[PDB]
Design a protein around this ligand. Sequence first.
Ligand code: MG
Ligand code: MG
Lengths: 436, 435
Amino acid sequence: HHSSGVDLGTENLYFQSNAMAGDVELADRARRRACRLLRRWLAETHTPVEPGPLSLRIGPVRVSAEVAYRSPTGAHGFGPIRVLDAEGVPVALADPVLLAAACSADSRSRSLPSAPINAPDAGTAVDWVLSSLADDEDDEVPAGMTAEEAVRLLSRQVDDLPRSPGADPWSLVAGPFAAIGRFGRAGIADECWLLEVLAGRLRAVDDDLSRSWLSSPTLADRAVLVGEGLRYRPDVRPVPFDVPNPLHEGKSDVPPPPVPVLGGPWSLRPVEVAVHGDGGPDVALVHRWMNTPHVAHHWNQAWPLERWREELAHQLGGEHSLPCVVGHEGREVAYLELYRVTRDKLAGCYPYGPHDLGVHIAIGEREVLGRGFGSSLLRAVAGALLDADPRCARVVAEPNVHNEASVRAFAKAGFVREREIGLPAKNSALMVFSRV
Amino acid sequence: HHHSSGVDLGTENLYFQSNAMAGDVELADRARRRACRLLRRWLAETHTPVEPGPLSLRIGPVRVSAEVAYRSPTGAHGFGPIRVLDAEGVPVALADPVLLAAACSADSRSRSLPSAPINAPDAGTAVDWVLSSLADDEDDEVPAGMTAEEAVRLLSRQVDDLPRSPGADPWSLVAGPFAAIGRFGRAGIADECWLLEVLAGRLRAVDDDLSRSWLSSPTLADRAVLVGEGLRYRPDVRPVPFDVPNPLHEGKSDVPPPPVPVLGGPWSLRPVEVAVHGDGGPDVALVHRWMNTPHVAHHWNQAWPLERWREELAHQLGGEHSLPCVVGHEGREVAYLELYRVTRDKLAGCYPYGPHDLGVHIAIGEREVRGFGSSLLRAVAGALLDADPRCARVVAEPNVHNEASVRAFAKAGFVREREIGLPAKNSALMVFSRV
Ligand SMILES: [Mg+2]
Ligand SMILES: [Mg+2]
């Protein structure tokens, strides 16, 4: 006699509570899925990761999670992933389809509207995650596995790599590296040490792939969330991209960026920062330009004067970036950073040569100056850089694919669009001006 | 210099992190409440029947199952854990809100026509909507210690403050007082059947025109957020009206079974004959044949073994709901149809029906044995109106995707009146009205 419910016996309670027992595992499976998505999002955007709090804007939601274990292969161990409101209040747990929707909105927004990921019949990562819920979950690493047994399996996997012509270059990341990360995240062994063991195992095979994987500064991986060429029918059709190679060495003895000498109406000189007092008029010029709206909309570095004063001094003191003032017929009109790719965020995004040089540019005195001048300056800088460093093979840039006037200026100057790349705050057209 | 892949831990670190973890329990409960709100809407807007005990349903690409612990007279059901099941019935996920919204969206967009506003490229999706609502202030809960006395007070005030005559908006009764009754019921404050009695008295007390409507129609206006060809999400949802069963309405009329119409002209119609002896007889064999040919099974989805159809036909013939018949055209037995009483049918929750309303499902077996289709439909509707003088209209519910059928019904004199959400499809409600 209950009418709005079921009349309850102990047998009823038994059936249902038995069912409630597997829910703990279900929640754990959702956690594992959301973590797999977050790792891919971090790798495919080349977002830097450190131990401790991680804070991220993914499409329409703010996402945050503690990085309890930072993995050298990106196999990070996370705390609870939470969605935050504008003030920083947790309003939700970031379950997998939620992450898939946020990532999809962000990725589709990063690429151009004409891109394949944005075609009407392309599907979305939400369809892909949805259609995958019944997939067999992979076995976990045995929590009690020995490090010796870990080396055993890893060598097995490295030798069994097709290691021949026709085989897939991304196989190293997909197989041996993935295993190393799961071993690391389980606490079985240290990943840096497992990578050394992997390195020697590759020296033992004088195959062509083996030598490549030991020497190139980046490695082939496959992206499932970021990339203009993505499709989900409803299954993901991944697209290739490049990631940093942990087996390739740290610092190199590459000199600082050279000071080119521009031809034509253009002039260029390094930025000067006085140790004494304010920092000088160059610090104020850049600071002024960087805080105007049309520049911060691209550079997003609208900082106080003293933060820019120390950024410039930090760059000048180092071997990475060289800040310069550009003149046109007597007037100081532009700021540039010339940088060595090898010491730059760009080094994780494409197979660079050791002397590769990049250019960031902000036109400050556009306000009453310039039309057609863009390609001209870019062309003058690119050629002068190749002239100043004969060991430099190419000059590169990474305008936002949405900055269509910038992309056009680079192409008209002679840069060619080599690929799209995923960066922490944008997708870029990788523009390459090659030496011939 | 001891922890490179992690942070060096002190008690203050543990304190910061565990404090933040205490709030996760409320976060999970908030997701649970959102998912339940979405499932209640999905069940209401698809008119899916709900009883206490296990509930199992297909939503787009996923199978969903949940225990119905509290079956609410206003659809404010109380659920156990909502799980996604694979083909064998093994749970593979907990159905969190954005998951449910994505399955419901895929299913709804699939239910409506490609030209529908819900399917435009510039339309949002329920996913955009749920996503954009996570930072909303969660709505106040019913105070668990509230009295039923206080429940009636607030309910009476709310019904009396309804706009009544000026301005209209009829979905206000379901959206206002009924929503409160369901929340009171689900919280255990009072019995919903009792709260509905109380609400009825307050509506008799004014006898305005809306109050009179709300006590007499067999359906009520409600507003849909997941199912409906005209839905849009401008991040925020733009609801569309639809009808739901009226709990305040008695019904239970002494409505007879369907009559046997008499077709003239080239047409003939007789009830199906089911032999007790052996196979079931030649009519059971005819329907079985037709229902398993490809062009019919693509719409009816009843390409069954002969033994199942013998028992289906006999079950219909024995009851008061549906009447299976064989239709001839100039001597050849060419079609099968069911005439059914709406008041005993799933259609009864979808529009304000009259007690004697009659419906038609039809399958043409002897296909082109072309153009004869609307003519048959027109003959049946008129003959049904002749056979039952108290019947107000003849209806049908072709799948909105079955446009050849919809067109044939319109050419016969039916009006495509609205789209309706049904358990396995959206249908175009075709109405052949007597006046
Ligand atoms: Mg009992
Ligand atoms: Mg410690």
